[PDB]
């Protein structure tokens, strides 16, 4: 019937939302799913709605709507922005160790700024003895045996890292935010604010 400009704009808005909420799980999107779950009876003007959705998905959100395979009627949003930041694994990565280090540094912060060598060893391989030996020589850790091997962060870490960034790490390790762990978080604020003066 008589569809206004707003009706059409609300229509392409449903379409761009549909593609966004779906793509975030790498779906990929099917035309049949599109025609069924958002288009409806606006199928008579579908190619125009689709095109307007594509440019709005591009100009506003910076995604390129691409048919991943020719003649497949299936689409994918491709990020047309700057590469960095879910980014660089598909290309550029830091030394594996730095990853290993981050867990150990994180694991220490988790247990309460302290941990015994044998525990983390049961964690690690799942050169655990050698890497955690020169990490102390690099002053990334501390290898004290004073009342076992008792672990702490050592001097270097504080200059290259903060407990908040570690907390940002342990959050992103499997999804979370620091806030989830206010036990850990609360002292990070006492550190983040302390980093000022």
């Amino acid at each position: 019937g008589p569809r206004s400009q707003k009706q059409l704009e609300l229509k392409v808005s449903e379409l761009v939302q549909f593609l966004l909420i779906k793509d975030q799980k790498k779906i990929p999107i099917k035309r049949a799913d599109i025609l069924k779950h958002v288009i409806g009876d606006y199928k008579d003007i579908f190619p125009d709605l689709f095109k307007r959705a594509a440019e709005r998905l591009q100009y506003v959100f910076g995604y390129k709507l691409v048919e991943l395979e020719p003649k497949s009627n299936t689409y994918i949003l491709i990020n047309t922005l700057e590469p960095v930041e879910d980014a660089e694994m598909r290309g550029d990565q830091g030394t594996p160790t730095t990853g290993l280090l981050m867990i150990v540094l994180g694991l220490i912060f988790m247990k309460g700024n302290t941990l015994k060598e044998t525990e983390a060893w049961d964690f690690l391989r799942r050169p655990k003895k050698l890497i955690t030996e020169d990490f102390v020589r690099q002053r990334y850790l501390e290898y004290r045996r004073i009342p076992d091997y008792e672990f702490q962060w050592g001097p270097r870490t504080n200059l290259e890292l903060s407990k908040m960034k570690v907390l940002k790490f342990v959050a992103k390790v499997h999804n979370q935010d620091p806030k989830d762990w206010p036990a850990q978080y609360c002292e990070a604020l006492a550190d983040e604010e302390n980093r000022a003066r």
Partner: protein, 236 residues
């Protein structure tokens, strides 16, 4: 409207996250600017600029205040009313109905909270694919993860993002069960109520209305306010 790449990356990350506290979007704004190095405009000007570009899509970056302590939050919100589709697209049919059942319990609740045991009893009622309590316990935590629900003491309430997203839907669907604040006239899930009359207030609203007042009185019946007066939210 004038739309640069720092605005697009801002919108991209504002959707990966469900909702952000004001200090975290200012952190996000500066973040996007440092990956493209000009003057960082005021957060208000930055947001108002984007919303004028989103007008043709009838969505906006909408400011909201939480109902527990009143901190400012920001989420990408539909101007429309049938905004149930944002979760309807993201979840399954049974997970959907589970949220609806949970929503019904939270609204009808006095505290604005519904226990897990009360929600898990409606599992057999769920439309779509058959699920069980073990699975339903996971879905509720997923709602917490995606900032649709907030859990306290084994009880669930609506996240501030949820209220921002579908306040329009909630009111039009449950007009007899919904609660509105006497001060801001907006949707109320949790809050304080007078014991003389029956009006209710958002915790941050009673905080500002009774601010610095040595004898808090209910604006409707002028009776002494029975409950504790919180202190207004200050970013420090």
């Amino acid at each position: 409207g004038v739309m640069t790449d720092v605005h697009r990356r801002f919108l991209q990350l504002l959707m990966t996250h469900g909702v952000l506290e004001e200090w975290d979007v200012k952190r996000l704004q500066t973040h996007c600017y440092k990956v493209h190095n000009a003057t960082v405009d005021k957060l208000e000007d930055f947001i108002n600029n984007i919303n004028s570009v989103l007008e043709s899509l009838y969505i906006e970056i909408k400011r909201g205040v939480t109902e527990d302590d009143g901190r400012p939050i920001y989420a990408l919100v539909n101007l429309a009313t049938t905004s149930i589709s944002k979760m309807a697209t993201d979840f399954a049919e049974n997970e959907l109905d589970l949220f609806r059942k949970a929503l019904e319990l939270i609204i009808d609740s006095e505290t604005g909270f519904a226990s897990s045991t009360n929600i898990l009893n409606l599992v057999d009622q769920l439309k779509g694919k058959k699920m069980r309590k073990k699975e339903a316990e996971q879905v509720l935590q997923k709602f917490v993860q995606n900032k649709w629900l907030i859990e306290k003491e084994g009880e669930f309430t609506l996240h501030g993002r949820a209220i921002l997203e579908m306040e329009q839907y909630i009111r039009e669907t449950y007009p007899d069960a919904v609660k509105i604040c006497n001060i801001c006239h907006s949707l109320l899930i949790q809050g304080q109520s007078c014991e003389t009359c029956g009006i209710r207030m958002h915790l941050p609203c009673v905080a500002k209305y009774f601010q610095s007042n040595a004898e808090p009185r209910c604006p409707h019946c002028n009776d002494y306010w029975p409950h504790e007066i919180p202190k207004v939210f200050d970013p420090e």
